[PDB]
Every structure is written in C-alpha cells, then in structure tokens.
Coordinates of C-alpha atoms and ligand atoms in Angstrom, one line a residue:
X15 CA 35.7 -11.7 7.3
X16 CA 36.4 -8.1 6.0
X17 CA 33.7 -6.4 4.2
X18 CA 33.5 -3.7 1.8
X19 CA 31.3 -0.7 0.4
X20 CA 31.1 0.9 -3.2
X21 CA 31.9 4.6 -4.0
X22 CA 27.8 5.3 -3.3
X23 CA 27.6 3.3 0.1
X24 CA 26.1 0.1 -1.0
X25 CA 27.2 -3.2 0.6
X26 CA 29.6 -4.8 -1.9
X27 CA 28.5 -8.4 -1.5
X28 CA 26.7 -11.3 -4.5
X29 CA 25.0 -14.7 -4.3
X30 CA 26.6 -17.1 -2.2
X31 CA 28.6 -14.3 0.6
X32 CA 27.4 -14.5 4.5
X33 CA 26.6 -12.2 6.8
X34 CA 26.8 -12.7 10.7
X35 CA 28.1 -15.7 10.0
X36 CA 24.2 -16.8 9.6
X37 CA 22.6 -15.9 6.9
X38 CA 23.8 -17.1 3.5
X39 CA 22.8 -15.0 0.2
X40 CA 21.0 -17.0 -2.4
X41 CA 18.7 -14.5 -4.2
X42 CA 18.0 -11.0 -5.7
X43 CA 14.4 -10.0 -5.0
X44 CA 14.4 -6.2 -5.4
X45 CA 16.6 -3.1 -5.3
X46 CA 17.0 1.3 -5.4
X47 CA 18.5 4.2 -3.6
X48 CA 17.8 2.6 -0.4
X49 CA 19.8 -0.9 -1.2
X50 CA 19.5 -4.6 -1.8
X51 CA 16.8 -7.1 -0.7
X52 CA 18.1 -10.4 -1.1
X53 CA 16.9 -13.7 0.1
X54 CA 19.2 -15.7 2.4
X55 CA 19.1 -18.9 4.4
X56 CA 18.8 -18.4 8.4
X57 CA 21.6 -21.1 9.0
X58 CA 20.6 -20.6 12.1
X59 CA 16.9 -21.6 12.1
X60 CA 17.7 -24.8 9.8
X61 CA 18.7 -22.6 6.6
X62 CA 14.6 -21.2 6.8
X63 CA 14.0 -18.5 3.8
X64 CA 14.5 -14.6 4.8
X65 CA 13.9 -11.7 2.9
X66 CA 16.6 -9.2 4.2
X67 CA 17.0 -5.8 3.4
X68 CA 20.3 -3.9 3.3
X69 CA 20.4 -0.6 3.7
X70 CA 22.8 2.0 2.2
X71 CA 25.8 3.9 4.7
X72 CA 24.3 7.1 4.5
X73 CA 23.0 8.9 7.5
X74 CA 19.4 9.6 6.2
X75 CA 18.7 6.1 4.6
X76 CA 19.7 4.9 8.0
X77 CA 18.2 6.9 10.4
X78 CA 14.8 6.4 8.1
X79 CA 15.4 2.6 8.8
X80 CA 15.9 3.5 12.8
X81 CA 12.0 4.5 12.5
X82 CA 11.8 1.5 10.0
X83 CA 12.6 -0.8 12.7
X84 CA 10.7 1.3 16.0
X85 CA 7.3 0.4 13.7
X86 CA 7.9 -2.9 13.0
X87 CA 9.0 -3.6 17.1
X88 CA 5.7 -2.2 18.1
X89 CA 3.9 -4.3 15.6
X90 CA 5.8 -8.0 16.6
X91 CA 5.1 -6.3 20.2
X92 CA 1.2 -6.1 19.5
X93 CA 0.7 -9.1 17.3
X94 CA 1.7 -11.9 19.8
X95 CA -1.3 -14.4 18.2
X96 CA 0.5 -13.0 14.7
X97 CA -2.9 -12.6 13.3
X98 CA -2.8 -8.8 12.1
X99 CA -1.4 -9.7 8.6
X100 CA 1.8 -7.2 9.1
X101 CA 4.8 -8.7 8.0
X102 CA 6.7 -10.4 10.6
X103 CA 10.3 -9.0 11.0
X104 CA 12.4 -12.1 12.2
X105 CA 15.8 -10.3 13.2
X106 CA 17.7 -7.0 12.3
X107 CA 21.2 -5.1 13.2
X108 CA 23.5 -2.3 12.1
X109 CA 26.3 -4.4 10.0
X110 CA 28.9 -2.4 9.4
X111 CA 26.9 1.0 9.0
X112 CA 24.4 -0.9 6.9
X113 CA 20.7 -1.4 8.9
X114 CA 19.7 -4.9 7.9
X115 CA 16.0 -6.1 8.6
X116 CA 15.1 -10.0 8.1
X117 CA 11.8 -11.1 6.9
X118 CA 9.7 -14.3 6.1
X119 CA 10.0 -14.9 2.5
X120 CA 6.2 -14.4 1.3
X121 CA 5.2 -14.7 -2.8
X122 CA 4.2 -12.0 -5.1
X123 CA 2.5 -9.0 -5.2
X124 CA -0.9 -8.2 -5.8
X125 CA 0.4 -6.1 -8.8
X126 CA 3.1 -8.7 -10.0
X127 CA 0.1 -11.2 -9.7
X128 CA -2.2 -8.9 -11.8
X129 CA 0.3 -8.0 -14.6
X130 CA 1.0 -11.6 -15.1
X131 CA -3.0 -12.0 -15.7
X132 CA -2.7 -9.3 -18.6
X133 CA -4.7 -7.1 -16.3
X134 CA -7.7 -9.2 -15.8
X135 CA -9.6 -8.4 -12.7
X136 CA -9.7 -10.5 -9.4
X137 CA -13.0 -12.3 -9.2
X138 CA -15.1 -10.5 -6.1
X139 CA -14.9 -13.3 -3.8
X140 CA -11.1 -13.0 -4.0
X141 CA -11.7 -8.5 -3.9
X142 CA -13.7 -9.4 -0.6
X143 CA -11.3 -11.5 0.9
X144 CA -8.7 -9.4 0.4
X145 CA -10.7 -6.6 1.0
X146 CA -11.5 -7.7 4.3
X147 CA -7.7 -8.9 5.1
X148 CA -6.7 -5.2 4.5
X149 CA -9.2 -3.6 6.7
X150 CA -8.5 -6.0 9.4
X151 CA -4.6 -5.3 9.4
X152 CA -4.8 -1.5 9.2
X153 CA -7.7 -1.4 11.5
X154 CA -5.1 -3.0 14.0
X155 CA -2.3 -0.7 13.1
X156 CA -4.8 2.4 13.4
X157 CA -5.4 1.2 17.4
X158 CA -1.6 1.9 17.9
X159 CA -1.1 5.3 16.7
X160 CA 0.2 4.2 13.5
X161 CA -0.8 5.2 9.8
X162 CA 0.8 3.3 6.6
X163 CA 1.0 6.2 4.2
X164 CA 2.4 4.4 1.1
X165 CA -0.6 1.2 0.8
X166 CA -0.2 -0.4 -3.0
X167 CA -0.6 -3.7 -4.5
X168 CA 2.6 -3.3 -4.8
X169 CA 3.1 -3.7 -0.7
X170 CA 0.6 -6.4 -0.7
X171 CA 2.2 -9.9 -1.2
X172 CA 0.5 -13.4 -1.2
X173 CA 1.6 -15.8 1.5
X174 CA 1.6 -18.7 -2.0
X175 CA 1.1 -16.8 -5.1
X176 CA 0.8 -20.5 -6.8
X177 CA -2.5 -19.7 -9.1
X178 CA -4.7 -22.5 -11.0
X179 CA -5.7 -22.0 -14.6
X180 CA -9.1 -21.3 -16.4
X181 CA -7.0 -16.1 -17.5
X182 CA -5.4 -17.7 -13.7
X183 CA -6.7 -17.6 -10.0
X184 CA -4.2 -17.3 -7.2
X185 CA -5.0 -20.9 -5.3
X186 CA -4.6 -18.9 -1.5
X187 CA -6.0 -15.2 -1.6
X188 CA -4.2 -15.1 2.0
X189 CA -1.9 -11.5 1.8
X190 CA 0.7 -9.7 4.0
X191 CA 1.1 -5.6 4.4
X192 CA 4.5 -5.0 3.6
X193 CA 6.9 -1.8 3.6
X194 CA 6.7 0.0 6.6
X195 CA 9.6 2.5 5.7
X196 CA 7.1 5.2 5.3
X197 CA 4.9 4.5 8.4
X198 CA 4.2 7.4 10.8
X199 CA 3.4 7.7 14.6
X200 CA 0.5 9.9 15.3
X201 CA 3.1 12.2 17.6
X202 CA 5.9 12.4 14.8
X203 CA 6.9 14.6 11.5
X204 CA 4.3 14.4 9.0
X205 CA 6.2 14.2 6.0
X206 CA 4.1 16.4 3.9
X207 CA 3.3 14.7 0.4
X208 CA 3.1 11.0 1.5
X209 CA 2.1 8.2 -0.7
X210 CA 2.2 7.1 -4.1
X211 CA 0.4 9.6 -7.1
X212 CA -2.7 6.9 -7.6
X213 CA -3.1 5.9 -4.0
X214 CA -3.1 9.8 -2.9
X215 CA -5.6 11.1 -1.1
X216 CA -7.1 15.1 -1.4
X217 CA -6.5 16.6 2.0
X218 CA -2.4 15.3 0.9
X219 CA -2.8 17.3 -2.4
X220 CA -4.8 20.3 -0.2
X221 CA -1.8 19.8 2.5
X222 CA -4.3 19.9 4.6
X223 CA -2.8 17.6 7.4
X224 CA -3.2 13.6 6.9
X225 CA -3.6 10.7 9.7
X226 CA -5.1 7.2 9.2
X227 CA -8.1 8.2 6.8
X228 CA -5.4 8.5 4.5
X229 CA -4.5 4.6 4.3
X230 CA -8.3 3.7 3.9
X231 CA -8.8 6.0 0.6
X232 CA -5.2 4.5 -0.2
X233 CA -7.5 1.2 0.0
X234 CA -10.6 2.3 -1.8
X235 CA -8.4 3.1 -4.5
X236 CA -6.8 -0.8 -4.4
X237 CA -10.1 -2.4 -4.2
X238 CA -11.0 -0.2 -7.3
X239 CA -7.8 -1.6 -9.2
X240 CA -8.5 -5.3 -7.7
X241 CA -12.0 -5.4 -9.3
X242 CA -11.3 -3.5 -12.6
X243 CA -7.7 -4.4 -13.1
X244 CA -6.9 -1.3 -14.2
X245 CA -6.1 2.1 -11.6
X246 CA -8.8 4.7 -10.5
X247 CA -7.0 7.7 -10.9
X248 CA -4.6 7.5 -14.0
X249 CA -2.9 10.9 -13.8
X250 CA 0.5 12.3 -12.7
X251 CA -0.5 16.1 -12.2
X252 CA -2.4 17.7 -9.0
X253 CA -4.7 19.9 -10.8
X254 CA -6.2 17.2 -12.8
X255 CA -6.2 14.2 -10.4
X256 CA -8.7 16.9 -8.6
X257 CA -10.7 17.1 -11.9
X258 CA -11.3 13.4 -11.7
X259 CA -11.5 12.9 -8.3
X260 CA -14.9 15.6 -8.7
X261 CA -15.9 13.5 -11.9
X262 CA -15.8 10.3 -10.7
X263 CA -17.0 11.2 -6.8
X264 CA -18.6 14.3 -6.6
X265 CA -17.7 18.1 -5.8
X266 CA -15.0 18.6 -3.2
X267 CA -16.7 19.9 -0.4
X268 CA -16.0 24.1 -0.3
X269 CA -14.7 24.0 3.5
X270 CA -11.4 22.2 2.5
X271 CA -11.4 24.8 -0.7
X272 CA -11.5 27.2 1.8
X273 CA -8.9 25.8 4.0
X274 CA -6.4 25.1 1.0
X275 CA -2.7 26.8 0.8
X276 CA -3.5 25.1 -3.3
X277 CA -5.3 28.3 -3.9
X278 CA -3.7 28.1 -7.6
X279 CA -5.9 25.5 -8.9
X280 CA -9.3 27.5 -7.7
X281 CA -10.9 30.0 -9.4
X282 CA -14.2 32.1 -7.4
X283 CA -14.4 28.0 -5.4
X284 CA -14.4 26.1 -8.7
X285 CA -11.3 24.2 -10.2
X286 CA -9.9 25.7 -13.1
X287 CA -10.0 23.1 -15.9
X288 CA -10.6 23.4 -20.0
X289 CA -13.3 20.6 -21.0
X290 CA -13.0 21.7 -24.4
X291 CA -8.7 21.0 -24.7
X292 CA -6.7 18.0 -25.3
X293 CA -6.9 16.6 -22.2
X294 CA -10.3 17.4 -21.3
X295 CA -11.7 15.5 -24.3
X296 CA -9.6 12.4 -22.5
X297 CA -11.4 12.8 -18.4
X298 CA -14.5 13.4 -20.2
X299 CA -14.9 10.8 -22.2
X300 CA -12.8 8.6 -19.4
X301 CA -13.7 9.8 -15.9
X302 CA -17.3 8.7 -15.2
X303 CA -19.5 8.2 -11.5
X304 CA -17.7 5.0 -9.5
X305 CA -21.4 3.8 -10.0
X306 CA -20.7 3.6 -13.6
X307 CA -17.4 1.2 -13.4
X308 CA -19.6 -1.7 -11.7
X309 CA -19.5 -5.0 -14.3
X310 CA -23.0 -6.5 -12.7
X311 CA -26.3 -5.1 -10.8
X312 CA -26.4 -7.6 -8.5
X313 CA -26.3 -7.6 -4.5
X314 CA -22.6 -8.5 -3.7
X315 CA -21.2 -5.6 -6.2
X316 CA -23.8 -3.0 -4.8
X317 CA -22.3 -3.7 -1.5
X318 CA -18.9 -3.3 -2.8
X319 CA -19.5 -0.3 -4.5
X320 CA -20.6 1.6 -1.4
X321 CA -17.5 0.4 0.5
X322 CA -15.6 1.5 -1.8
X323 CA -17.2 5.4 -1.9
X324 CA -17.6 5.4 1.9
X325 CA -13.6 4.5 1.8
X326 CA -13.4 7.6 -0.9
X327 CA -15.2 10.5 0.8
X328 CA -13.1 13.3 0.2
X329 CA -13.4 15.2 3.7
X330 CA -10.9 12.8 5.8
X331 CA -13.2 13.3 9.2
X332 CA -16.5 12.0 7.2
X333 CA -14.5 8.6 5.2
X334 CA -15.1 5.5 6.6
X335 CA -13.0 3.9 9.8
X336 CA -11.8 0.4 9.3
X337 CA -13.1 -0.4 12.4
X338 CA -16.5 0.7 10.9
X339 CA -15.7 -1.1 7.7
X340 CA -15.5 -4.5 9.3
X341 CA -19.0 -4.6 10.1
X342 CA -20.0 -3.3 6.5
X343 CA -22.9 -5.8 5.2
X344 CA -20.2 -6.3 2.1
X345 CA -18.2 -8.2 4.4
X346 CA -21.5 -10.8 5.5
X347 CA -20.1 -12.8 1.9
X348 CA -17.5 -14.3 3.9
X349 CA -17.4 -17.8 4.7
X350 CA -16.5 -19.0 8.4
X351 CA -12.8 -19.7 7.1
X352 CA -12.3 -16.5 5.0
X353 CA -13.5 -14.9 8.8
Ligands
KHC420 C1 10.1 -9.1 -2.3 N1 10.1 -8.2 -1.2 C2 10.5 -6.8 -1.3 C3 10.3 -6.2 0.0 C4 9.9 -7.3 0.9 C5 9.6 -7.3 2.2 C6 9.3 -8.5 2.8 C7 9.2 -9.7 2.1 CL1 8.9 -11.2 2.9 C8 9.4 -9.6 0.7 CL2 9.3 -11.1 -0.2 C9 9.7 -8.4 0.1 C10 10.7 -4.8 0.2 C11 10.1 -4.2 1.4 N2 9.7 -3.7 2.4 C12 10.1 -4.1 -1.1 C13 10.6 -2.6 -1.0 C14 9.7 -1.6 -1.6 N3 8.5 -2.2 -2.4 C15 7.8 -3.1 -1.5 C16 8.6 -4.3 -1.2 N4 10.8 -4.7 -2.2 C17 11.1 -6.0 -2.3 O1 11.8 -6.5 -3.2
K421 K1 2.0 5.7 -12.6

C-alpha cells in the first residue's frame, strides 16, 4: 500500500507498518541524518529478528549506501564459513528511493556495555578475546582491499550482551564489526579526514594518505579504552591530540613533519605547545608513557602493552599488520575455544 516521505526525505512509517509485504516494524534501535534503524520480523524466514536500516531520499545518502552495500556483497561473498566476524547483511533493496539494508539482530555495544558498568574496565581475558576477535576480522577485510576507517566500541556489538554480576561481566565476550558506511576500496576516493576524533590516527591529522594501518591504530586505541575504561586520547583539537600523542608515545618521527601540508602546528620541527598555560597544566599532569597506564607487572599485561604500542606506531608503514598481530605471544592466553 502507498507510502509516504517527510518534508526532509525520511520514510514516514512507526511500530507496527510493513515493508515488502515481509518485514514487520516492531522496534526503534537507532537514528540521524542518514535515517531509521528499526528492528522488524522477516515474516518470511518465520518472523526471525532484523536490524534494517532505512535510508533517507537524498542522492548523496543513497549513493553512500550504493558503496554501503558493494562492501558488505564482497564480505557475504568472502565469508562463506561466516567466520570473519563482519556483520552478516541478510537482504537489501531501493524502496521507494529509500536504500534499505537487513541485518541479524546482535546485542549491545562495547560502549553501551561499558557505560552501563560505570566505566569499569573489561577484565584482560575478555580485552584478549576481543582483542583477538578484532584482529582476526580486519585482518580478513585487509586481504580484500578493504580498510574500515570509522572502528569504535561503538561499531562493536556482542552477539548476547546478557552479563552476570560480581561491577557485571558480559556472559559471551563473542562480538560483530559493524557499520561499514565508511569503508573504502584500496582503488577508490580517500575521503580525506576519516574516523572518529579518539580513534584517529596521525598520518589522517598530517593528511598524509591513510590505508589499512589506519583501522589497527583505530584498534590500539579500543584495546586502550577496553582495559582502562576510559579513552586514550581525550581531546577534540588537532594541535593538541599531537601533544599527547608525543607524550604518551614518543616524538613523531621528523620525516612525516617534513612531509606535512599541517605546517601550522610546527615550529623549526617541534610542535608548538605552552606547558606552562591552562591546558598544558591538564596533558601534563594527565598524558603520561602508555607504560605508565598498566594496572599490574605481571606477564599477560606486558604482552598487552606492547600490542598495543606496536598497533600505535606513529609512522603507518612501521605499525603493526593484523596479520602479524595474530601471532603476537599476547595472543598464546587463549584457550582452544576462545581460538
Ligand atoms: C543497533 N544497531 C545499529 C546499527 C546496527 C547494525 C547492525 C545490527 Cl545487527 C545492529 Cl543491532 C545495529 C547501525 C549500523 N550500521 C548503527 C549506525 C551507526 N552506529 C553504529 C550502529 N546504529 C544502530 O542503531
Ligand atoms: K568525544
């Protein structure tokens, strides 16, 4: 039956409309300036849970999702055993101007999950399953010409966020990559700034180019947040997210000052920045050597740690591969399951 948009292009539609005759609305799960996701029934795969995603009638919101959609087709095309940890998309078509992508239903996010814990850290075991979850689904996506560019806890969702009590532990530490809106082919546009402020790597800031080194600091900087509970790089201004960076890691190797259109930020190959000026007093007391953040001495935490700064080498063609961070002696903790 006749459908219907809103004077800003969104799908007019609530809790309990169809589309396709198939799917039945049920849920609101998120929103923005792209659309809706709401979960539905498949009515036609005995009324099983969807996630779908509505997009807007406008011609750049859909011809983002076009791409949307080539990614997630070379993904179902790669992942035949399904054992990459990408998010399975179960269906998708162009109703009525409006690109609409179906999804398994999966639980919350990694962030949702860690804001309901009042910030308390993930115990390691859970940091190095997850840990090792992540690197094995990118790893698979770098193979295939594919970076993420936009890797968050927010885009990492438990399969069963059900959590036991103790302060809470999620009962399955099994997760799903999620949001593949921003994701890139190694032969297209490089959108030039590319993901989000805290997950953002240097040679992004430097606009220095970017491939798939950028989703692996993306992940150093998770598996920071996962064991502290709290985000690496807590700034929303280039300049001094470099200051920390240098604080925390080390000095930015002069080459990529050299190379930098960012020439603003430089003075005679040192960053300009006022230690002794509001915001100074702040990094210096807050921004200290990664070694510094780790909560015990022993073995396991050690072998985080240098994960973690191998994943957060500032020149992109010296960081760790994924490929190379599989075999990393943090990842010999894992039991035969968790492998
Ligand atoms: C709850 N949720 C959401 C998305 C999902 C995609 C797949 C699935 Cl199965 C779920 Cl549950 C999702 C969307 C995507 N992609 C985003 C869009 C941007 N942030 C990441 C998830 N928002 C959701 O509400
Ligand atoms: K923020």
């Amino acid at each position: 039956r006749s459908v219907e948009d809103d004077k800003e292009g969104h799908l007019v539609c609530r809790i309990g409309d169809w589309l396709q005759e198939r799917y039945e609305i049920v849920g609101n799960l998120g929103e923005g300036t792209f659309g809706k996701v709401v979960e539905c029934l498949d009515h036609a795969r005995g009324k099983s849970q969807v996630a779908l995603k509505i997009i807007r009638n406008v011609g750049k919101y859909r011809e983002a999702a076009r791409l949307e959609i080539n990614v997630l087709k070379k993904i179902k095309e790669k992942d035949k055993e399904n054992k990459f940890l990408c998010v399975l998309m179960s269906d998708w078509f162009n109703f009525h101007g409006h690109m609409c992508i179906a999804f398994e239903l999966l639980g919350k996010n990694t962030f949702e999950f860690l804001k309901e814990n009042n910030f308390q850290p993930y115990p390691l075991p859970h940091v190095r399953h997850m840990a090792y979850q992540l690197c094995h689904a990118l790893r698979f996506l770098h193979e295939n010409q594919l970076t993420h560019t936009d890797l968050k806890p927010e885009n990492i969702l438990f399969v069963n966020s059900e959590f036991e009590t103790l302060e809470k532990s999620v009962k399955n530490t099994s997760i799903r990559v999620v949001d593949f809106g921003s994701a890139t082919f190694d032969h297209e546009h490089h959108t030039t700034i590319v993901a989000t402020r805290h997950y953002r790597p240097p040679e992004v800031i430097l606009e220095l180019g970017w491939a798939q080194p950028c989703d692996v600091w993306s992940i150093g900087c998770i598996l920071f947040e996962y064991y502290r509970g709290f985000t690496l790089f807590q700034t929303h201004e280039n300049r001094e997210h470099l200051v920390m960076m240098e604080k925390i890691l080390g000095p930015i190797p002069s080459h990529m000052i050299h190379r930098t259109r960012k020439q603003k930020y430089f003075y005679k190959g040192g960053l300009v920045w006022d230690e002794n000026s509001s915001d100074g007093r702040y990094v210096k007391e807050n921004c200290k050597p990664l070694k510094s953040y780790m909560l015990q001495d022993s073995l396991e935490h050690v072998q985080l740690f240098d994960l973690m700064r191998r994943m957060l080498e500032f020149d992109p063609a010296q960081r760790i591969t994924l490929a190379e961070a599989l075999l990393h002696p943090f990842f010999a903790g894992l039991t035969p399951e968790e492998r």
